[PDB]
Amino acid sequence: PRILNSDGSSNITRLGLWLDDHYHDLLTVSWPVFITLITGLYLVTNALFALAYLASGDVIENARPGSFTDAFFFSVQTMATIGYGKLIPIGPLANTLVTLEALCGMLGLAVAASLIYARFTRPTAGVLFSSRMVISDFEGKPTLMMRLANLRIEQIIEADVHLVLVRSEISQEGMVFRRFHDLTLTRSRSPIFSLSWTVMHPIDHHSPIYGETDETLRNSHSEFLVLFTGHHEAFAQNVHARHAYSSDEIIWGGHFVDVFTTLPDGRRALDLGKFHEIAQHH
Amino acid sequence: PRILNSDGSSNITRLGLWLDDHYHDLLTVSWPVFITLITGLYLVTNALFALAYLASGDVIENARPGSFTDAFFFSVQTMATIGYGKLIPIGPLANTLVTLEALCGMLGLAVAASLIYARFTRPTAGVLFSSRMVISDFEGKPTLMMRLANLRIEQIIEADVHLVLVRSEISQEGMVFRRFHDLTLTRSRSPIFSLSWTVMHPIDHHSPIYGETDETLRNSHSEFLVLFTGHHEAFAQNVHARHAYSSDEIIWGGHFVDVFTTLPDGRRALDLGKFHEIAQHH
Amino acid sequence: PRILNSDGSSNITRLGLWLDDHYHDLLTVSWPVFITLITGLYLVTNALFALAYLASGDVIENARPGSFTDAFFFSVQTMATIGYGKLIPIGPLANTLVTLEALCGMLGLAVAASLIYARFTRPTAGVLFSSRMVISDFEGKPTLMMRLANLRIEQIIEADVHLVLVRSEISQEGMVFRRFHDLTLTRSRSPIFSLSWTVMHPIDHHSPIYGETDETLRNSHSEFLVLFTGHHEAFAQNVHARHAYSSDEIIWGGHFVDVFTTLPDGRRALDLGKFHEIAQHH
Amino acid sequence: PRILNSDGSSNITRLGLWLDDHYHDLLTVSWPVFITLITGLYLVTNALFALAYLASGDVIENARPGSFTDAFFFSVQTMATIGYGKLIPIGPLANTLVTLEALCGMLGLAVAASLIYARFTRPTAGVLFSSRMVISDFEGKPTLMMRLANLRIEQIIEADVHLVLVRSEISQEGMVFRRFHDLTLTRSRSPIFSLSWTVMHPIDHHSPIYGETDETLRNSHSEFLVLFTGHHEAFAQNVHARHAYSSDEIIWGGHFVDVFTTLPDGRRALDLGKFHEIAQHH
Ligand SMILES: [K+]
Ligand SMILES: [K+]
Ligand SMILES: [K+]
Ligand SMILES: [K+]
Ligand SMILES: [K+]
Ligand SMILES: [K+]
Ligand SMILES: [K+]
Ligand SMILES: [K+]
Ligand SMILES: [K+]
Ligand SMILES: [K+]
Ligand SMILES: [K+]
Ligand SMILES: [K+]
């Protein structure tokens, strides 16, 4: 079983555990549940105002006396500010509730808009991760590599990548634990990420995987977490993306196929159909 | 008396000291006070428009002449744009005030929405702090430790922790002062914080608490401030959380109980009922 | 003449130089000019719709034929969605313009709200700068110092300070220029800034002002720029503040008076009436 | 052919490749296409409600039976909340659809406002790049230089610049590739960028262009990418700007003309008409 899923999420059951986190819940529920909650409060509030009008008496013009239906639809036309003009308030109290209901309708619109903006304005990075890593010689050193691709034409500014090894380790007190190792990279910051980025960890005598083999990486249940962050121009907003690799997904001796090609016209070109293609000696 | 409270706030009386900071005050007052302020301005503005209409004359259809009540409710139905159709403006001046009032109503809605969004969209980190710290051997060194837990299923990106010692010190000029010491950590940046994080300060010969005891930490009135920051996925927004520990709350020789367990099914599992459990030799 | 003003702004005349920067201009003009611009477009757009209705003919119920006044106020009641019900559209064209005008009114509300939110949500740091700097011995080294104070009860997270020397220098090619020197600080990052912060630059043999005197600092026209940045809890938003000091404003041998006092009750207390008080030997 | 355009964008044809990225597309399409899309959905939704009302029967007051036109305009006056009062719902079903349509109108306004705010609030840095670079002696070292200018009076806080060399290189395994070199700068962070900034890369024995000539830079197809980032005070928001230079655009032996002048009055002054002027020995 893999501790980390391919999407970079955790695979641990949270056994540890309706308005204790209401703001978080309103932003994280599905859209149909969200729209349903908004609708319920919308209807519930009008029903409450309908009861308020009736409690005052027959204070709605052209309304059947004691009718909740008529009072409710008058509440709707008031809170929403439709104000057709057939059902209208009679007397100071009805007109005072109307003054209140209008305020309530504006406040509710502001709240609903605030929540919708927070849910909408959560963009995706649009970044593709290579399905595998490779370990192969680069500049005379065995180098762990993966690569990323921008799926959009807009560029990503101040793009950072973090490659973390997660493996079970034993302390000199005999304590066995999962340790996280930030892997030194040749380039961790790309000021402008536009097309493709080959992320590289030279396995030098300081690397946590120096001397390791495919087999020793399994025995430590070694996994590799990748985090990408950057400022996306399409959104003028920060974005991120995560991914995880198991030891099984390292191609020892592999080489990523070049995704940059030259056309017959001589134009430089990016072919992302080879993004997952790895070359290997047989 | 503790200079810092458990929540990381200061315990100093600010003896040093209604529109001098109005924007800050509108975002920091309680919600009932905020709603009351919005309501007051709402009613006050309509009253001002009611006086404006009356000052022009009897320019409201179906309104009792000289009646503020009728003019006020006509202002309400105009600013809120209900426009039932019984009370309507008569003449160019009343219609000009209506044109103005509608603008005022839109501007006021935009302002109210701006303030509501700023007050709403202030999420909490959802991070739990261990009730105590511990000092115990890790990797052959006495190590000060505390730990954090994510109370939500959504992950926190680029999570930083800062462990600061605050203690009374004396300069070589004889000046006694409170100094803040950033404590070097084994891991200060966790690219993805999902479940639990054990924060560690190896007390090596460079540590400000190297050689200190429980007693010497009291005599210096030593306290420990913790700051957590990160980008929460649930909100696509930055969050933070703070906490403070006294010397009394360091368990010398303690060991945090492991919150990660394996179920009979073999699934890895997180039990946060042991988050505050510390093991100690007796 | 001082190149930098006390507020950290530049004192250089920009001799180098209406819709070339319209978005910037809408956020930077004063509020009365902004409200005036919004009003003008509001009235101008209704006038344009009034002409559109008249161009179709007498298509407004209860409107005097050919009257711009009546058509204009009907546009107002339509765009603002008041819809009293006396002036109403006649025929498909008038009703089509109404369908368009309503859309225009919603789009204009969204635009106006977007601009208002951007102008409103620009908080101030609430940070006070000491009126002077001091140079005095701290930990056995002459140390340039200034200090900051939080004027609010809410804390500022991840607070950074940058102390820059600006002075006229000569290159070994003989070129005279203004150079900026980032001055090393004992603490440049305070994870939680709550009350007061004494910023310190030890003048060691690496300091750009090592060996300088009050007189040599004048001859180089030396100035000191201060930048403060942090995440304010009151706003859950980043804030900043700037300030500048001339050489005249350095008190050689000065010592800032302690703003932390103990009350008769024994409570620790912050007295900001001594924030600008400096002690000097005579 | 230049791999990077002067604006810092990539010049590679993306051969690699309507609701697969709908949120990105709504923010990136032109404004006329955006307004057209909003209009279409606006009209389409009203048409759907018109059909709903007719499907119930003749439930609209003063409406011609079976007329889509009349039902459609009644939908408009309901969703937009105009509510003139001539066309009004008859019976519980029509009034229930009205209750729904009003909600739909509010939700659609919130969505439209959210998208408009995201598209509007994407400010430009207002930063000018010198049309050329220069290599000339500074402080006794040949130094690559370009410079930036603030086109606005508002200052930019925590301004960063990154100067990257891009050139074709060969690995010791014989692999030819484009490598990116972060060029060390004398100043990469200017805490307050107000007027002009001369960015400098001393070509010391560690520089990737140490020993290179104008000719060798061509043979490697060397290009220089510039990224500027900062917090603009006019917007209280982060901004950025990018630019690219070819080897052809380096003036060997050049010196940027000083843009700072003193007036007859003695006031320091900034003349940006000389921003692109370079002095060269002939
Ligand atoms: K309305
Ligand atoms: K409304
Ligand atoms: K309104
Ligand atoms: K209305
Ligand atoms: K009406
Ligand atoms: K409206
Ligand atoms: K809004
Ligand atoms: K908004
Ligand atoms: K916003
Ligand atoms: K925002
Ligand atoms: K009517
Ligand atoms: K509406």
Residue numbers in the entry:
A (entry chain A), B (entry chain A), C (entry chain A), D (entry chain A): 12 to 28, 33 to 297
Sentences from the paper on this structure:
We have utilised the prokaryotic Kir channel KirBac3.1 to determine whether the acyl tails of bound lipids, protruding into the conduction pathway through fenestrations just below the selectivity filter, might represent key gating elements. In KirBac3.1, the four Leu124 residues form a steric cluster physically occluding the conduction pathway, separating the cavity into upper and lower vestibules, while Tyr132 (at the inner helix bundle) forms a non-occlusive hourglass-shaped portal between lower vestibule and cytosol. Here we present evidence that in Kir channels, a limiting barrier to permeation within the conduction pathway is formed by a collar of branched aliphatic side chains. We show that acyl tails of tightly bound lipids occupying conserved fenestrations into the pore engage individual side chains of the collar, drawing them away from the central conduction pathway and allowing ions to pass.
The mutation was made on a background in which two native cysteines were mutated to serine (C71S-C262S; SCS) and thus we also determined a structure of the KirBac3.1-SCS background crystallised under the same conditions. To cross-validate this experimentally, we mimicked isolated lipid tails using alkyl-methylthiosulfonate (alkyl-MTS) reagents, derivatising a native cysteine residue (Cys119) located near the midpoint of the bilayer at the outer opening to the fenestration on an otherwise cysteine-less background (SCS); the same background as used for L124M. All crystal structures of native KirBac3.1 show the conduction pathway is occluded by a Leu124 cluster, indicative of a favoured low-energy state. In every instance, we observed extended fatty acyl chains of lipids occupying fenestrations near the midpoint of the lipid bilayer, a phenomenon also observed in crystal structures.
